[PDB]
Amino acid sequence: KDYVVIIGSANIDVAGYSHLNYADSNPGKIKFTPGGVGRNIAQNLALLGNKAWLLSAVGSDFYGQSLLTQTNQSGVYVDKCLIVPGENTSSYLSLLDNEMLVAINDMNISNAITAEYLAQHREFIQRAKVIVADCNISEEALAWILDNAANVPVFVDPVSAWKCVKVRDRLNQIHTLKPNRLEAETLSGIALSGRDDVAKVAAWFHQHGLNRLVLSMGGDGVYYSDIRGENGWSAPIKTNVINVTGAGDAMMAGLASCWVDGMPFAESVRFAQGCSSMALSCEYTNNPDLSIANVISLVENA
Amino acid sequence: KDYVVIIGSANIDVAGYSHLNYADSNPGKIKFTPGGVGRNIAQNLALLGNKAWLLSAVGSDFYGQSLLTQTNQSGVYVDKCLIVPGENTSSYLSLLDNEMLVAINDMNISNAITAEYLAQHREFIQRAKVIVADCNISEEALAWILDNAANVPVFVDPVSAWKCVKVRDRLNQIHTLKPNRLEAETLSGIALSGRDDVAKVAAWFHQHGLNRLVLSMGGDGVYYSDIRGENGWSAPIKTNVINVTGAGDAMMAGLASCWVDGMPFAESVRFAQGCSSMALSCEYTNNPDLSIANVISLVENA
Numbered sequence: 391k392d393y394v395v396i397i398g399s400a401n402i403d404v405a406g407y408s409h410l411n412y413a414d415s416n417p418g419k420i421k422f423t424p425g426g427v428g429r430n431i432a433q434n435l436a437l438l439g440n441k442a443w444l445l446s447a448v449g450s451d452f453y454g455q456s457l458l459t460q461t462n463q464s465g466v467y468v469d470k471c472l473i474v475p476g477e478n479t480s481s482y483l484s485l486l487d488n489e490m491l492v493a494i495n496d497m498n499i500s501n502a503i504t505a506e507y508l509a510q511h512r513e514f515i516q517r518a519k520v521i522v523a524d525c526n527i528s529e530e531a532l533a534w535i536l537d538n539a540a541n542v543p544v545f546v547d548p549v550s551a552w553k554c555v556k557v558r559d560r561l562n563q564i565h566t567l568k569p570n571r572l573e574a575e576t577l578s579g580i581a582l583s584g585r586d587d588v589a590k591v592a593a594w595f596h597q598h599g600l601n602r603l604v605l606s607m608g609g610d611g612v613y614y615s616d617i618r619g620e621n622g623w624s625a626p627i628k629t630n631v632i633n634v635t636g637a638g639d640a641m642m643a644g645l646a647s648c649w650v651d652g653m654p655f656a657e658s659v660r661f662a663q664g665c666s667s668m669a670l671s672c673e674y675t676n677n678p679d680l681s682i683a684n685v686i687s688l689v690e691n692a
Numbered sequence: 693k694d695y696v697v698i699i700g701s702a703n704i705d706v707a708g709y710s711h712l713n714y715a716d717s718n719p720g721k722i723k724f725t726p727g728g729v730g731r732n733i734a735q736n737l738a739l740l741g742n743k744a745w746l747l748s749a750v751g752s753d754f755y756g757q758s759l760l761t762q763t764n765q766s767g768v769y770v771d772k773c774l775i776v777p778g779e780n781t782s783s784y785l786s787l788l789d790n791e792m793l794v795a796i797n798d799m800n801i802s803n804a805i806t807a808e809y810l811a812q813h814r815e816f817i818q819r820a821k822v823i824v825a826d827c828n829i830s831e832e833a834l835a836w837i838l839d840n841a842a843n844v845p846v847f848v849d850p851v852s853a854w855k856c857v858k859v860r861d862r863l864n865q866i867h868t869l870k871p872n873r874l875e876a877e878t879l880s881g882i883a884l885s886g887r888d889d890v891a892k893v894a895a896w897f898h899q900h901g902l903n904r905l906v907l908s909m910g911g912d913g914v915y916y917s918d919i920r921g922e923n924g925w926s927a928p929i930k931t932n933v934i935n936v937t938g939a940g941d942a943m944m945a946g947l948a949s950c951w952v953d954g955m956p957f958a959e960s961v962r963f964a965q966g967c968s969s970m971a972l973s974c975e976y977t978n979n980p981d982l983s984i985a986n987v988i989s990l991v992e993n994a
């Protein structure tokens with residue numbers, strides 16, 4: 391009865407492209423994918439074999455319930471997700487071409503994931519092996535999670551350069567943070583011009599009380615640092631990338647899962663990279679052939 | 693046990709706008725509305741009080757099942773709508789601004805609404821008081837409907853200038869056609885420069901065997917013509933137009949419904965205009981306050 395709790399946003403990604411110029415109902419292709427950092431992480435966790443509870447918010451509309459249902463049949467326990475009356479399920483609209491042209495995000499239902507709401511599941515949350523939170527939620531909600539985790543490790547996904555900042559004053563309450571270059575720069579106030587500067591950035595994070603840093607630098611690789619002194623680089627699992635979406639979602643899932651499985655820091659980072667790689671090689675936001683098995687086959691094939 | 697059968701397309705309309713410039717996830721607002729000419733006509737018919745069966749196609753995805761469910765709880769009988777495996781539910785994506793910027797339509801599952809499919813409901817179709825078909829379906833499918841209607845009146849919505857053409861050779865099999873200016877011009881090969889040319893256009897339609905013509909000219913009004921000699925104009929119900937979508941859908945519903953209610957042609961046209969007016973004054977694709985009562989109140993306020 392070990393379970394993982396993911397507190398994040400549940401979205402519908404809608405992607406459309408043509409086969410193009412404006413003020414015209416132009417023929418093309420549209421796809422509805424299930425999305426949202428929290429939701430995607432929960433799903434990757436279920437595909438990794440953990441029993442994952444999603445604490446998110448969808449609307450009273452029917453498409454919310456289709457998001458929930460689709461998520462549930464992926465192995466995720468969505469029966470505490472909040473259904474909000476009157477308001478609409480959040481979404482990520484994305485206009486492409488044969489390659490993004492533009493994108494809209496409507497994610498205000500994330501503000502419904504309140505302190506009140508999580509407080510009604512305090513005990514349940516405090517009896518998880520691991521809590522994973524994304525920064526789509528309000529500052530009040532993230533503060534509540536970090537203040538009432540009862541020594542349950544909180545893994546935090548910073549999401550964006552804009553949304554990561556709510557983490558700055560609470561690095562001492564976070565077990566593992568996984569920022570990208572821009573996010574780390576935005577948090578520390580130190581430029582990540584090159585591979586020379588990861589040390590000062592990590593040192594900044596550790597002096598502000600961050601237990602573990604998992605820093606994705608892109609092509610440079612992943613730099614990981616433990617406040618107890620262990621640090622290192624891991625070079626990318628070089629891959630045939632079709633779409634990049636769900637990469638970080640998969641990596642977060644890998645980190646939390648490996649932690650729950652008793653794996654060491656470095657090897658958990660390598661495994662997580664394998665996961666994100668599987669994500670990079672799938673047209674969909676989450677890969678339904680993500681497994682401990684073929685992630686390990688992607689890793690031993692190093 | 694009188695029922696109405698609607699054979700058309702079932703879509704999800706997605707509308708997104710900002711608070712906008714490119715290569716950026718712009719915070720904004722997204723709405724999923726149920727749509728598709730056929731589906732909307734069925735819904736307006738249910739709100740007009742008829743018991744309406746929808747023969748459409750949605751995908752094996754979950755959002756299809758949500759389209760069906762929302763439509764069913766709007767009062768429509770969707771239990772013969774086809775759920776197609778492997779392929780995804782069709783949709784009308786719309787990028788707006790505070791004013792449409794661009795639109796994509798993905799409507800290829802409409803080609804799954806086959807002759808085989810309708811033939812498996814031959815009996816049921818042939819025992820309706822009226823059949824309503826849209827030109828989103830294939831030429832083979834429309835030809836099958838018109839060839840096996842068993843003297844059940846077929847009301848046809850032409851949909852677009854591009855899609856209306858499949859109606860040209862089968863006007864003698866159609867009870868009532870409702871084209872716009874552009875559609876009538878495209879069908880007849882006669883220019884509708886002004887209100888002078890409605891007579892020649894209508895005469896062209898009647899010599900090609902069309903029983904009834906309901907011609908919407910926009911601000912000019914609605915010109916209606918019976919192959920038996922009755923014709924006339926009806927001036928628009930001037931309204932507070934918020935968005936225009938679902939106008940013609942509402943009008944078609946009004947026409948079919950009024951026909952089923954034994955109403956005369958002209959008064960059915962006036963009533964139908966009232967319906968479209970209710971639609972014009974609702975932000976949504978279908979107005980849930982469309983009713984015999986308050987449309988008739990929109991008409992008596994003439």
Ligand SMILES: O=c1ccn([C@@H]2O[C@H](CO)[C@@H](O)[C@H]2O)c(=O)[nH]1
Pocket residue numbers: 399401402403424425426427428430481482495497526549550635636637639675717
């Ligand atoms: O602020 C944002 C932007 C995107 N996403 C989600 O992240 C995924 C892309 O990695 C998609 O599911 C998208 O909905 C969020 O959760 N928050």
Ligand SMILES: O=c1ccn([C@@H]2O[C@H](CO)[C@@H](O)[C@H]2O)c(=O)[nH]1
Pocket residue numbers: 701703704705726727728729730732783784797799828851852937938939941977
């Ligand atoms: O070829 C098309 C284009 C649009 N629509 C639908 O018609 C409505 C607008 O009148 C919307 O629901 C839209 O999805 C169709 O059914 N077919």
Ligand SMILES: [K+]
Pocket residue numbers: 633634635636637669670671672673674675676677
């Ligand atoms: K992916």
Ligand SMILES: [K+]
Pocket residue numbers: 935936937938939971972973974975976977978
């Ligand atoms: K409308």
